[PDB]
Scaffold this active site. Structure first.
Site, PDB file in Angstrom:
ATOM      1  N   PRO A  83       7.479  -0.781   3.876  1.00 42.98           N
ATOM      2  CA  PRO A  83       6.006  -0.599   3.976  1.00 42.98           C
ATOM      3  C   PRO A  83       5.422   0.723   3.506  1.00 42.98           C
ATOM      4  CG  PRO A  83       7.028  -0.695   6.167  1.00 42.98           C
ATOM      5  CD  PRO A  83       8.096  -1.051   5.195  1.00 42.98           C
ATOM      6  N   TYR A  84       6.256   1.758   3.378  1.00 44.48           N
ATOM      7  CA  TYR A  84       5.749   3.083   2.996  1.00 44.48           C
ATOM      8  C   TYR A  84       6.322   3.557   1.660  1.00 44.48           C
ATOM      9  CZ  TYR A  84       3.871   3.023   7.687  1.00 44.48           C
ATOM     10  OH  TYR A  84       3.142   2.657   8.800  1.00 44.48           O
ATOM     11  N   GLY A 118       7.729   6.532   1.282  1.00 45.54           N
ATOM     12  CA  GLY A 118       8.959   7.181   1.712  1.00 45.54           C
ATOM     13  C   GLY A 118       8.930   7.418   3.209  1.00 45.54           C
ATOM     14  N   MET A 119      10.089   7.524   3.786  1.00 48.29           N
ATOM     15  CA  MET A 119      10.217   7.862   5.201  1.00 48.29           C
ATOM     16  C   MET A 119      11.330   8.899   5.285  1.00 48.29           C
ATOM     17  SD  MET A 119       9.221   7.716   8.306  1.00 48.29           S
ATOM     18  CE  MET A 119       9.966   8.885   9.546  1.00 48.29           C
ATOM     19  N   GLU A 120      10.965  10.054   5.830  1.00 45.85           N
ATOM     20  CA  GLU A 120      11.774  11.252   5.898  1.00 45.85           C
ATOM     21  C   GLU A 120      12.911  11.177   6.929  1.00 45.85           C
ATOM     22  OE1 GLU A 120       8.467  10.943   6.779  1.00 45.85           O
ATOM     23  OE2 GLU A 120       8.013  12.327   8.434  1.00 45.85           O
ATOM     24  N   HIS A 122       7.948  15.245  -1.429  1.00 44.85           N
ATOM     25  CA  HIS A 122       7.259  15.109  -0.143  1.00 44.85           C
ATOM     26  C   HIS A 122       8.285  14.837   0.943  1.00 44.85           C
ATOM     27  CE1 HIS A 122       3.775  14.246   2.401  1.00 44.85           C
ATOM     28  NE2 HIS A 122       4.587  13.426   3.047  1.00 44.85           N
ATOM     29  N   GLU A 123       9.179  13.829   0.733  1.00 41.78           N
ATOM     30  CA  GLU A 123      10.160  13.542   1.798  1.00 41.78           C
ATOM     31  C   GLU A 123      11.141  14.696   2.000  1.00 41.78           C
ATOM     32  OE1 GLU A 123       8.552  11.398   3.200  1.00 41.78           O
ATOM     33  OE2 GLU A 123       7.698  10.277   1.511  1.00 41.78           O
ATOM     34  N   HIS A 170       9.605  17.316   4.280  1.00 43.01           N
ATOM     35  CA  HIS A 170       9.604  16.975   5.712  1.00 43.01           C
ATOM     36  C   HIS A 170      10.859  17.508   6.419  1.00 43.01           C
ATOM     37  CE1 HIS A 170       6.099  14.661   6.672  1.00 43.01           C
ATOM     38  NE2 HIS A 170       6.304  13.685   5.781  1.00 43.01           N
ATOM     39  N   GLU A 177       1.880  16.137   8.254  1.00 44.92           N
ATOM     40  CA  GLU A 177       1.610  15.731   6.862  1.00 44.92           C
ATOM     41  C   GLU A 177       0.905  16.761   6.032  1.00 44.92           C
ATOM     42  OE1 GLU A 177       3.241  13.438   5.637  1.00 44.92           O
ATOM     43  OE2 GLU A 177       3.895  12.288   7.397  1.00 44.92           O
ATOM     44  N   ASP A 231      -0.510   2.646  13.957  1.00 46.48           N
ATOM     45  CA  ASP A 231      -0.419   1.955  12.655  1.00 46.48           C
ATOM     46  C   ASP A 231      -1.798   1.615  12.080  1.00 46.48           C
ATOM     47  OD1 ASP A 231       2.345   2.123  12.677  1.00 46.48           O
ATOM     48  OD2 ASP A 231       2.630   0.075  13.431  1.00 46.48           O
ATOM     49  N   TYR A 246      -3.115  13.730   5.713  1.00 46.71           N
ATOM     50  CA  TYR A 246      -2.449  14.290   4.554  1.00 46.71           C
ATOM     51  C   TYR A 246      -3.397  15.207   3.777  1.00 46.71           C
ATOM     52  CZ  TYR A 246       1.215  10.685   4.851  1.00 46.71           C
ATOM     53  OH  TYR A 246       2.248   9.870   5.248  1.00 46.71           O
ATOM     54  N   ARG A 284       4.585  -2.339  -0.324  1.00 44.27           N
ATOM     55  CA  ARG A 284       4.183  -0.973   0.040  1.00 44.27           C
ATOM     56  C   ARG A 284       2.701  -1.029   0.432  1.00 44.27           C
ATOM     57  NH1 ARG A 284       4.501   4.104  -4.078  1.00 44.27           N
ATOM     58  NH2 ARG A 284       3.716   5.772  -2.711  1.00 44.27           N
ATOM     59  N   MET A 285       2.394  -0.666   1.700  1.00 45.03           N
ATOM     60  CA  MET A 285       1.052  -0.889   2.226  1.00 45.03           C
ATOM     61  C   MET A 285      -0.060  -0.248   1.418  1.00 45.03           C
ATOM     62  SD  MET A 285       1.323  -1.336   6.272  1.00 45.03           S
ATOM     63  CE  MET A 285       2.283   0.036   6.629  1.00 45.03           C
TER      64      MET A 285
HETATM   65  N1  LIG Z   1       5.951  10.061   7.332  1.00 44.60           N
HETATM   66  C1  LIG Z   1       5.429   9.222   6.212  1.00 44.60           C
HETATM   67  C2  LIG Z   1       5.793   9.871   4.852  1.00 44.60           C
HETATM   68  O1  LIG Z   1       4.711  10.780   4.651  1.00 44.60           O
HETATM   69  C3  LIG Z   1       5.961   7.777   6.271  1.00 44.60           C
HETATM   70  N2  LIG Z   1       5.453   7.081   7.433  1.00 44.60           N
HETATM   71  N3  LIG Z   1       6.086   6.051   8.030  1.00 44.60           N
HETATM   72  N4  LIG Z   1       5.398   5.663   9.111  1.00 44.60           N
HETATM   73  C4  LIG Z   1       4.334   6.615   9.144  1.00 44.60           C
HETATM   74  C5  LIG Z   1       3.263   6.614  10.188  1.00 44.60           C
HETATM   75  C6  LIG Z   1       2.703   7.845  10.524  1.00 44.60           C
HETATM   76  C7  LIG Z   1       1.710   7.904  11.486  1.00 44.60           C
HETATM   77  C8  LIG Z   1       1.248   6.714  12.061  1.00 44.60           C
HETATM   78  O2  LIG Z   1       0.246   6.779  13.016  1.00 44.60           O
HETATM   79  C9  LIG Z   1      -0.697   7.756  12.856  1.00 44.60           C
HETATM   80  N5  LIG Z   1      -1.544   7.749  11.809  1.00 44.60           N
HETATM   81  C10 LIG Z   1      -2.490   8.699  11.709  1.00 44.60           C
HETATM   82  C11 LIG Z   1      -2.668   9.681  12.685  1.00 44.60           C
HETATM   83 CL1  LIG Z   1      -3.890  10.903  12.429  1.00 44.60          CL
HETATM   84  C12 LIG Z   1      -1.816   9.695  13.782  1.00 44.60           C
HETATM   85  C13 LIG Z   1      -0.850   8.684  13.876  1.00 44.60           C
HETATM   86  F1  LIG Z   1      -0.009   8.587  14.889  1.00 44.60           F
HETATM   87  C14 LIG Z   1       1.805   5.476  11.725  1.00 44.60           C
HETATM   88  C15 LIG Z   1       2.873   5.436  10.824  1.00 44.60           C
HETATM   89  N6  LIG Z   1       4.387   7.442   8.173  1.00 44.60           N
HETATM   90 ZN   LIG Z   2       4.820  12.592   4.938  1.00 44.47          ZN
END
Ligand SMILES: N[C@@H](CO)Cn1nnc(-c2ccc(Oc3ncc(Cl)cc3F)cc2)n1
Ligand SMILES: [Zn+2]
Ligand SMILES: [Yb+3]
Ligand SMILES: [Yb+3]
Ligand SMILES: [Yb+3]
Length: 607
Positions: free
Chosen positions: A263-264, A266-268, A292-293, A296, A315, A372, A380, A560-561
């Site tokens: 869904p993303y 990248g995930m770190e 970016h990853e 992190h 972020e 989510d 970011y 990818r969302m």
């Molecule tokens: N770390 C990424 C690479 O940059 C990949 N990534 N994978 N999952 C997620 C993710 C991150 C935060 C989420 O909730 C929030 N959103 C926005 C706010 Cl202000 C607070 C929150 F809690 C939901 C999902 N980010």
């Molecule tokens: Zn990130």
């Protein structure tokens, strides 16, 4: 307080270690096993504690070799169900005990996606991957599912012997399963304390290729060669990140290229960043996601947000380091080009949510909000814009990079709030407090909309993008013949993407203009996922029916969302494709990632 967790807070007790022993059953779509949590009391006379769970079946809880009483409370929507455990003996402050919970996940676990063989590249074996950020670790195992607690972990995972397991940890050997010779047990060790959202697992027919001194790329066999080439700049980026942030403490930096439903971007995950296969453009042009990853590994994984309301700390600083890596590799004019592009994405997010929306604030309040659903570019890009504005205000990038390195050193292995960050910024810049006091902190941190001040950006690389976009927007029918393939001859792929983003900000354009763009530029031929996504959104928003099958194919062939959600929303908003978009979502819903399925359903108003 962490309003997203139902567990006992860090002030009551803290998990220090997790020892996970589990088995992956693809026939039942369940992970079954034991989670042994080493928990340290933070209070005198502690007699019970609460853990987060979501759709978990609990068989029993063992402490001191005997079963103890526990109770699962009523489910609280996306937060799951609280699990209260009655301790057999009251604990003193700082006393540690081990609690072993036998559990099994649900096939509908929001942390996991189970893929059939037909859904993979090889077509012979199934595949499983997790995605715990932000609050999905509780849907894999019982835990204090809050980033305010950091723990080390060890794991032993039993899988069908033809498959490979990997985790966000150092590989620690493999053996045949002593209980079943058709299975193997893969072992893992994560010696650096992490928040539980960084726990990750993948099981599938994986192969690896070495691409640097501390990096293997992993994927199904069909993607290994392309991935090794795409991500070849990884070691160079790690060396620059170590220069900016200090030592890389995680040992290995491996990459896993997931199936297209990841869904993303990248995930770190520590030791093993997960990436979408939509980065496989063939020319390394989407490598900023790797930068970016990598970043992190300092901002997010070492210094972590204490609660999800402070997510921008993770972020914003990571985008800031990411843009310095790409600036070191390609020049300061390139850093400004990417920074200005980011401001344009922030403009789009603010316009989409609305300028007074609570999610356009930098520091948010997630009480009763599913993280989510809140996820967007705001933390970011509004976070990056604040740091870039402070860099300009405080004397430039060299000076601000000194602060960034000192910030990482100060808060390594900790979980912090915006006030902790601000207090350290004031302490580090004590000789410039008069300059810091000119910042409108209340507006930057707590007010919705675009920030109160826009930073200064070098326009060198952006000028040609703006000029070409304005030519198209201002063109009348009699000007269309003036456009030609030569218009793009001196534009990089980054500049083509920026030309499309600038144009998409003014969409729709007349249908004849979009048809002429395809005639002279042949954008339908471009496979670069970012350019193709913006071009297809421009086509659909401009009501070109020919683009409907292309947009539905892109929306469903990958997940990818960033791409799938706006493509489905654009298709639902175009009357000609509305029914097809709804029907396509309904047919694919069961085979989609659970989070993506939920979000696309909300976007489409399909229950
Ligand atoms: N770390 C990424 C690479 O940059 C990949 N990534 N994978 N999952 C997620 C993710 C991150 C935060 C989420 O909730 C929030 N959103 C926005 C706010 Cl202000 C607070 C929150 F809690 C939901 C999902 N980010
Ligand atoms: Zn990130
Ligand atoms: Yb070992
Ligand atoms: Yb202070
Ligand atoms: Yb004219």
């Amino acid at each position: 307080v962490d309003t997203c967790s139902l567990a006992s807070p860090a002030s009551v007790c803290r998990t220090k270690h997790l020892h996970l022993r589990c088995s992956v059953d693809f026939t039942r779509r369940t992970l079954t096993g034991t989670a042994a949590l080493t928990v340290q009391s933070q209070e005198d006379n502690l007699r019970s504690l609460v853990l987060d769970t979501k759709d978990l079946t609990i068989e029993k809880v063992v402490i001191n070799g005997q079963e103890v009483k526990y109770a699962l409370g009523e489910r609280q929507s996306y937060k799951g169900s609280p699990m209260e455990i009655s301790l057999p003996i009251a604990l003193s402050k700082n006393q540690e005990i081990v609690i072993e919970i036998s559990f099994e996940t649900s096939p509908k676990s929001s942390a996991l996606q189970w893929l059939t063989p037909e859904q993979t590249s090889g077509k012979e074996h199934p595949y499983l991957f997790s995605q715990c950020q932000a609050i999905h670790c509780r849907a894999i195992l019982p835990c204090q599912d809050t980033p305010s607690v950091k723990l080390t972990y060890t794991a032993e995972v039993s899988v069908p012997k033809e498959l490979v397991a990997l985790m966000s940890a150092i590989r620690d050997g493999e053996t045949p399963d002593p209980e079943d010779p058709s299975r193997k047990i893969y072992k893992f060790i994560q010696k650096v304390p992490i928040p539980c959202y960084l726990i990750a697992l993948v099981v599938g027919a994986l192969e690896s290729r070495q691409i640097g001194p501390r990096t293997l790329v992993w994927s199904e066999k069909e993607q290994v060669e392309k991935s090794a080439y795409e991500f070849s700049e990884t070691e160079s980026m790690l060396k620059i990140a170590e220069d900016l942030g200090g030592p890389y403490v995680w040992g290995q930096y491996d990459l896993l290229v997931l199936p297209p439903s990841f869904p993303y971007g990248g995930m770190e995950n520590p030791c093993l960043t997960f990436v979408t296969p939509t980065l496989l453009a063939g020319d390394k042009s989407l490598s900023n996601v790797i930068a970016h990853e990598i970043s992190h590994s300092w901002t997010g994984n070492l210094v972590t947000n204490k609660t999800w309301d402070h997510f921008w700390l993770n972020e914003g600083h990571t985008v800031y380091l990411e843009r310095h890596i790409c600036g070191r590799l390609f020049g300061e004019k390139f850093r400004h080009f990417n920074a200005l592009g980011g401001w344009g994405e922030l403009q789009n997010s603010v316009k989409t949510f609305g300028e007074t929306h609570p999610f356009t604030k930098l520091v948010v309040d997630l009480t009763d909000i599913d993280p989510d659903v809140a996820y967007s570019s705001v933390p970011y890009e509004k976070g990056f814009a604040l740091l870039f504005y402070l860099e300009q205000l405080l004397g430039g990038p060299e000076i601000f990079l000194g602060f960034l390195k000192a910030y990482v050193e100060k808060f390594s292995y900790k979980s912090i709030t915006t006030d902790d960050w601000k207090d350290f910024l004031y302490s580090y810049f004590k000789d410039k407090v008069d300059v810091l006091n000119q910042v409108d902190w209340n507006a930057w941190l707590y007010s919705p909309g675009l920030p109160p001040i826009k930073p200064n950006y070098d326009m060198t690389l952006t000028n040609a993008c703006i000029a070409l976009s304005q030519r198209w927007i201002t063109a009348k029918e009699d000007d269309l013949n003036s456009f030609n393939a030569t218009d793009l001859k001196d534009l990089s792929s980054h500049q083509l993407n920026e030309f499309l983003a600038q144009t998409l900000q003014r969409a729709p354009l007349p249908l004849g203009h979009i048809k002429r763009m395809q005639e002279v530029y042949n954008f339908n031929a471009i496979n670069n996922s970012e350019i193709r996504f913006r071009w297809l959104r421009l086509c659909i928003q401009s009501k070109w029916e020919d683009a409907i099958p292309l947009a539905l194919k892109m929306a469903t062939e990958q997940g990818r969302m960033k791409f799938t959600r706006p493509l489905f929303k654009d298709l639902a908003a175009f009357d000609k494709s509305h029914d097809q978009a709804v029907r396509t979502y309904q047919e694919h819903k069961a085979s989609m990632h659970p989070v993506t399925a939920m979000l696309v359903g909300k976007d489409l108003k399909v229950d």
